[PDB]
Amino acid sequence: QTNPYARGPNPTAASLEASAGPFTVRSFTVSRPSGYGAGTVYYPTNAGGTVGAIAIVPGYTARQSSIKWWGPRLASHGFVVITIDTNSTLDQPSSRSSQQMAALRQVASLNGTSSSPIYGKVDTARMGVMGWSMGGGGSLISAANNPSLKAAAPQAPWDSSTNFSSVTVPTLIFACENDSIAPVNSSALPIYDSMSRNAKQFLEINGGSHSCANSGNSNQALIGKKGVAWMKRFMDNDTRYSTFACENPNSTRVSDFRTANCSGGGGSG
């Protein structure tokens, strides 16, 4: 059967590493944010069907600028993306998760609002979560509390607990080798190791500082390829992306790679 959620052309490494995918992207700022501080919605104008929605949250003290690059990068491959500012820059992870879910709720509401640029563009049954540091911890909390989410891809995550063993959502963890804010061996890696009930992946950027996956980073080719491939594979069920999502990228830019329960296009063996 034709996968009803497949969008865009067959992927190549070059097309996933480029700065933009196939679709034209527009954006708007949310007029009256509902349950969070502010939001920018990125969306494809011509995806060829409804697409899933992804909500992205920054870390402590941080604002949309730190995570903004994901907006165009994901939306140009066929997603509606909302980046947010939290009610307070000093909100903790559980609050960030609530606000993340409120942003997804509002994307669904705008999909139903005839005046909105994303009217009828969203499949509100297919949602994902991303975010940086405390916003990454908030993404994992969102996944733990809302298992119908289709994918999570936090970056340099931190939470006051590293035990995310209840998560059944496919989760890709971006980590930064030299992170001194949320050190990998006390945060991102114990988080990754705690999850035994899901498809999961761990991708650590060689020499990365705590901001190694943020706007302006020097690995947008690899990080953007992996984020889009993960979201395509698991939010769209798009098996064209099974290998890009699950495979070791064999990159000089990677200082650790792990994956579990990720079938990468090799049959049953």
Numbering used by the authors: 1 to 269
The authors write:
A flexible linker (GGGGSGGGGS) was employed to link the corresponding anchoring protein with PETase and HFBI separately to prevent interference from occuring between each anchoring protein and its displaying target. To explore the structural difference between wild-type PETase and linker-attached PETase, the crystal structures of those two proteins were determined at 2.0 Å and 1.5 Å, respectively. In the structure of linker-attached PETase, we can only see a part of the linker (6 amino acids) in the form of an irregular structure, indicating that the (GGGGS)2 linker is flexible. The two active-site pockets were almost identical. The above results revealed that the C-terminal fused linker did not induce obvious structural changes in PETase. In the simulation, the (GGGGS)2 linker showed high flexibility, and no unique structure was observed when the linker-attached PETase was displayed by the yeast cell-wall protein GCW51. Moreover, this flexible linker separated PETase from GCW51 in space, meaning that the two functional units did not affect each other.
